[PDB]
């Protein structure tokens, strides 16, 4: 039906633009830039202009938070189209701010909020419409009080907008439009989508679970390092679904004697029961319910048991979802993670560069920036930053922007024009990057890598084999069932140092857009020296929760070398950490699409048990890079560096016969550093590109890292493992 649509979140941040689809417009006969009168629930309605985009489905309309709240509806609700009958332009339109959103800032609101928002933008306005505008490092809401030319109008440049004063009191059943929402979360698409899925039916459709009886998820546990926005995500979900958000703070619960703690837990659960669909959020769950063995007080044990029995009592269809955030997935009572109490677990995790960019764009939307703030350069060099680190960085830059113009124009309830006249310059961000101190620097990176097959030259057979083991079971799961045969879940790269094993693993992960986890030799040696091989389990857990994933074990022979050679020190090839890796590999399913890649420069000293079937059964030799791979190395290292066009990198890759990838990396690490040095000397004497002479000067110090004997040994190993037997003449008779 043309008068029945479903609400979705708007991609853009436009105040009064709704996105639809061309097939929907086909049955509506509407233009690209016309206006319609959308009628919402509770008799309310608004006027908005439509837009065309292909992201939404045929019968889905995208609306932003402010227009969605104007219609008194939420995501997924039913909204008609009802095109507006072309109401003429407005004349006076009186608008006033809301008292709560204007408190603290006073002055003339025309040149700062009203005029820039209404400049060169014909935005429809109704009597009951309230609109939010971002400026002066704030988000302020304005409500229209009256409109002389009919209740509907369209803002014209000559319209004399009036703002007398006396801000209106906040209404009864209208919520703040800038507190929390899905658009306040940065790049948590997978996790936020998971939470939306688990939470949609229990809360948006409560009577369904009083009439069907299927058990919905009752306990969701958000876990991840601190500062990743778990509380923010829970608040956003509760606000968007409209369910009553009850917040339980771990420290606040545990700061109240030995009485009121239990009373407060019980009262929170009863209040959530008495108040319709609700989300109970228990922030810092490990403060309330840690491992009951490590507790050394009776009241703590009673707190944990009371939480357990409250969670068990929330097995009925009371429409109360209990959410909990912890930084300790393994330091909360295991009895909480059982079925019926906290069944679902969501790992928030570190934001990637895209997520960091999204968070930075969210935190800087109200702030007036400059033109030089890239906001993507910082997002690429904020490694190890959780969203809280990024918020701290943004606030630090903004504060230093205020620390440069601090007492020039006095900020004595201060005027709006001076507030709007601020700017943050990119060098402030580059300053804060050196004063950042990321919290999650020492955290396992789980991200789809940016290495593609372009960054790798040659290795055509290796690329083919890798995509046979990874790309086929992922992108063609129809096979491996028709033929009834599981994909191999592991491969062992072997070859000389510096030949692209890491890049091959990253590129195969990126081709399937799979997560990539790298476990380097120092980490295996850390587990071996400290006898903390139990952490191997955790690594595989991270791989399983991040599926599809490539779990890469670089220099898998590190422990074997640390023990000596092939024998080692008296003992055999088995060690505790590689034994744990074997155990964890046997415990995977091949249906998780977790692929293990081990790399070793010394396949001779590797434990043979890891080469057995059901393990890294395929061995791939990664040889010394051929000339095409050398050209790729040179191009990849030289990209991001201004290099002269006359350099014959193809020629450069011809006498680098037995050179490894690290050899050419050092070749530019020297030529390009000579260029830097020449720049500095010429700048000293005076006060653009890596020339051919720089590359000749660097090649004058070119040495092969891997000797001929080592290459001979690698070739011998490859022969004895790949030359097979004399079965090349086999043929079925007739």
Ligand X SMILES: Nc1ncnc2c1ncn2[C@@H]1O[C@H](COP(=O)(O)OP(=O)(O)OP(=O)(O)O)[C@@H](O)[C@H]1O
Ligand Y SMILES: Nc1ncnc2c1ncn2[C@@H]1O[C@H](COP(=O)(O)OP(=O)(O)O)[C@@H](O)[C@H]1O
Binding residues for ATP: 226-232, 327, 363, 498-503
How many C-beta atoms surround the C-beta of residue 731 within 10 A? 5
> Could you say which of ligand X, a copy of itself, K ion, none residue 502 binds, taking C-beta under 5 to 8 angstroms by partner kind?
ligand X
Beta bridge partners of 600: 494
567 binds a copy of itself (CB under 8 A): yes
Two structure tokens written together for 345: 């677990």
Least distance to ligand X, CB of residue 665, Å: 4
Q: What is the CA angle 109-115-121, rounded to 5?
A: 145
Return the residues of window 27-56 that contact a copy of itself according to CB under 8 A.
Answer: none
Q: What are phi and psi of 280, to 5 degrees?
A: -90, 120
3-class SS of residue 675: helix
SS3 assignment, position 601: coil
Segment interacting with K ion (CB under 5 A) among 32-40, 231-239, 474-482, 499-507 = 231-239
Six token digits for residue 204:
């948006």
- Rounded Cα distance between 542 and 532, Å, is 17
Q: Whole-number minimum distance, CB 384 to ligand X, in Å?
A: 21
CB of 652 to a copy of itself, least distance (A): 8
Given candidates 38, 321, 459, 671, which one binds ligand X under the rule CB under 6 A?
459
Q: Which of residues 224-253 bind ligand Y (CB under 6 A)?
A: 226-232
User: CB of 513: closest distance to Mg ion in angstroms?
Assistant: 22
Does 171 engage in binding with a copy of itself (CB under 8 A)? no
Measured CA distances, 650 to 655, 656, 670, 673 (Å): 10, 10, 18, 21
DSSP E strands: which ranges in 202-295?
Answer: 219-223, 244-249, 278-283
> Residue 313 is inside which H or E element, if any?
helix 298-313
Decide if 417 contacts 112 (C-beta within 8 A).
Answer: yes
Q: Are 362 and 375 in contact, with CB atoms under 8 Å apart?
A: no
Pick the binder of ligand X from 661, 671, 672, 694 (CB under 6 A).
661
DSSP class of 471: I
Q: Which stretch binds Mg ion (CB under 5 A): 195-203, 496-504, 524-532, 562-570?
A: 496-504
Binder among 124, 135, 181, 186 for ligand Y (CB under 6 A): 186
Residues 6+ apart with CB under 8 A from 295: 301, 304
> How many other C-beta atoms can be found within 10 angstroms of the C-beta atom of residue 677?
11
Name which of residues 266 to 305 contact a copy of itself (CB under 8 A).
284, 287, 293-294, 296-302, 304-305
CB 186 within 8 A of CB 387: yes
Parallel, antiparallel or unpaired: strands 219-223 and 344-347 = parallel
Question: In 3-state terms, what secondary structure has residue 310?
Answer: helix
230 contact choice in ligand X, a copy of itself, Mg ion, none (CB below 5 to 8 Å, kind-dependent): Mg ion
Q: Give which of ligand X, K ion, a copy of itself, none residue 1 binds (C-beta under 5 to 8 Å, depending on kind).
A: none
Q: 272 forms bridges with which residues in the sheet?
A: none
In the list 277, 349, 387, 500, the residue contacting ligand Y (rule: CB under 6 A) is: 387
**Residue 230 CB, nearest approach to Mg ion (Å):** 5
Minimum distance of ligand Y from residue 365's CB (angstroms): 11
Q: Please identify, using beta-carbon distances, which residue of 124 and 351 lies nearer to ligand Y.
A: 351
Q: Whole-angstrom distance between the N-terminal and C-terminal Cα of the chain?
A: 67
Binder among 231, 264, 327, 618 for K ion (CB under 5 A): 231
Per CB under 8 A, 216 contacts a copy of itself: yes
The dihedral region occupied by 169, where left means phi > 0, alpha psi between -120 and 50, and beta the remainder, is beta
What character string, x for contact with Mg ion (CB under 5 A) and - otherwise, covers 596-635?
Answer: ---x------------------------------------
What does R_g of the chain's alpha carbons equal in angstroms? 31
**Closest approach of a copy of itself to the CB of residue 202, in Å:** 10
Cα 143 to Cα 120: distance, rounded to the nearest angstrom = 20
Nearer to Mg ion, 288 or 599 (CB): 599
Member of 609, 626, 628, 717 binding a copy of itself (CB under 8 A): 609
The residue ranges that bind ligand Y (CB under 6 A) are 185-186, 188, 226-232, 325, 359, 362, 387-388, 391
The residue ranges that bind K ion (CB under 5 A) are 231
The residue ranges that bind Mg ion (CB under 5 A) are 230-231, 283, 325, 501-502, 554, 599
The residue ranges that bind ligand X (CB under 6 A) are 455-459, 495, 497-503, 555, 599, 601, 622, 625, 629, 632-633, 636-637, 661-662, 665
């Amino acid at each position: 039906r043309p008068n029945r649509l479903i609400v979705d979140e708007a991609i853009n941040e436009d105040n009064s633009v709704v996105s639809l689809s061309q097939p929907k417009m086909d049955e509506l006969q509407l233009f690209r830039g016309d206006t319609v009168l959308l009628k919402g629930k509770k008799r309310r309605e608004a006027v908005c202009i439509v837009l065309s985009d292909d992201t939404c489905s045929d019968e889905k309309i995208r609306m932003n938070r402010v227009v969605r709240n104007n219609l008194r509806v939420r995501l997924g609700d039913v909204i008609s189209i009802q095109p507006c009958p072309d109401v003429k332009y407005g004349k006076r339109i009186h608008v006033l701010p809301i008292d709560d959103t204007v408190e603290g800032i006073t002055g003339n609101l025309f040149e700062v909020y009203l005029k820039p928002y209404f400049l060169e933008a014909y935005r429809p306005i109704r009597k009951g419409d309230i609109f939010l505008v971002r400026g002066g490092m704030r988000a302020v809401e304005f409500k229209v009080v009256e409109t002389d030319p009919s209740p509907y109008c369209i803002v014209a440049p000559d319209t004399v907008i009036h703002c007398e004063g006396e801000p209106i009191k906040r209404e009864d059943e209208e919520e703040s439009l800038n507190e929390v929402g899905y658009d306040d979360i940065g790049g948590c698409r997978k996790q936020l989508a998971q939470i939306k899925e688990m939470v949609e039916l229990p809360l948006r459709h409560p009577a369904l679970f009083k009439a069907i009886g299927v058990k919905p998820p009752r306990g969701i546990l958000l876990y991840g390092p601190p500062g990743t926005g778990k509380t923010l995500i829970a608040r956003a979900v509760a606000n968007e679904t409209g369910a009553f958000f009850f917040l339980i703070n771990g420290p606040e619960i545990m700061s109240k004697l030995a009485g009121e703690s239990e009373s407060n837990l019980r009262k929170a659960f009863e209040e959530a029961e008495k108040n319709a669909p609700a989300i109970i959020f228990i922030d810092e769950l490990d403060a309330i319910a840690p491992k009951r063995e490590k507790t050394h007080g009776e009241v703590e044990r009673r707190i944990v048991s009371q939480l357990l029995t409250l969670m068990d009592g929330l097995k009925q269809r009371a429409h109360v979802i209990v959410m909990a955030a912890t930084n300790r997935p393994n330091s909360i009572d295991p009895a909480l993670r059982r079925f019926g109490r906290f069944d679902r677990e969501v790992d928030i995790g570190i934001p990637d560069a895209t997520g960091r960019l999204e968070i930075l764009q969210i935190h800087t939307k109200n702030m007036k920036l400059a033109d030089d703030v890239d906001l993507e350069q910082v997002a690429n060099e904020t490694h190890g930053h959780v969203g809280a680190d990024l918020a701290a960085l943004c606030s630090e830059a903004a504060l230093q922007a205020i620390r440069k113009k601090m007492d020039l124009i006095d900020l004595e309830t201060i005027d709006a024009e001076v507030m709007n006249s601020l700017a943050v310059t990119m060098d402030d961000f580059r300053w804060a990057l050196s004063q950042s101190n990321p919290s999650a620097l020492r955290e396992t990176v789980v991200e789809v890598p940016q290495v593609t097959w372009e960054d790798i030259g040659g290795l055509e057979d290796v690329k083919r084999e890798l995509q046979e083991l990874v790309q086929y079971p992922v992108e063609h799961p129809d096979k491996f069932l028709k033929f009834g045969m599981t994909p191999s879940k592991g491969v062992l790269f072997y070859g000389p140092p510096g030949c692209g094993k890491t890049l091959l693993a990253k590129a195969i992960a990126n081709e399937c857009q799979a997560n990539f986890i790298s476990i380097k030799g120092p980490e295996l040696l850390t587990m071996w020296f400290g006898e903390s091989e139990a952490n191997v389990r955790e690594i595989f857990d991270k791989a399983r929760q991040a599926a599809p994933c490539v779990l890469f074990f670089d220099e898998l022979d590190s422990i074997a070398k640390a023990r000596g050679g092939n024998i080692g020190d008296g003992g055999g090839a088995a060690d505790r950490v590689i034994n744990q890796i074997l155990t964890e590999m046997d415990g995977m399913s091949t249906k998780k699409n977790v692929f293990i890649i081990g790399a070793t420069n010394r396949p001779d000293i590797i434990d043979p048990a890891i080469l057995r079937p059901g393990r890294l059964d395929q061995l791939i030799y990664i040889p010394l890079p051929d000339e095409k791979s050398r050209v790729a190395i040179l191009k990849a290292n030289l990209r991001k560096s201004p290099v002269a066009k006359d350099v014959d990198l193809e020629f450069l890759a011809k006498m680098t016969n037995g050179f490894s990838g690290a050899d050419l990396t050092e070749i530019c690490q020297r030529a390009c550093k000579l260029a830097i040095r020449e720049s500095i000397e010429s700048e000293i004497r005076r006060e653009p590109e890596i020339r051919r002479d720089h590359f000749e000067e660097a090649m004058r110090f070119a040495r092969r890292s891997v000797s001929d004997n080592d290459i001979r040994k690698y070739e011998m190993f490859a022969q004895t493992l790949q030359q097979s037997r004399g079965f090349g003449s086999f043929r079925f008779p007739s």
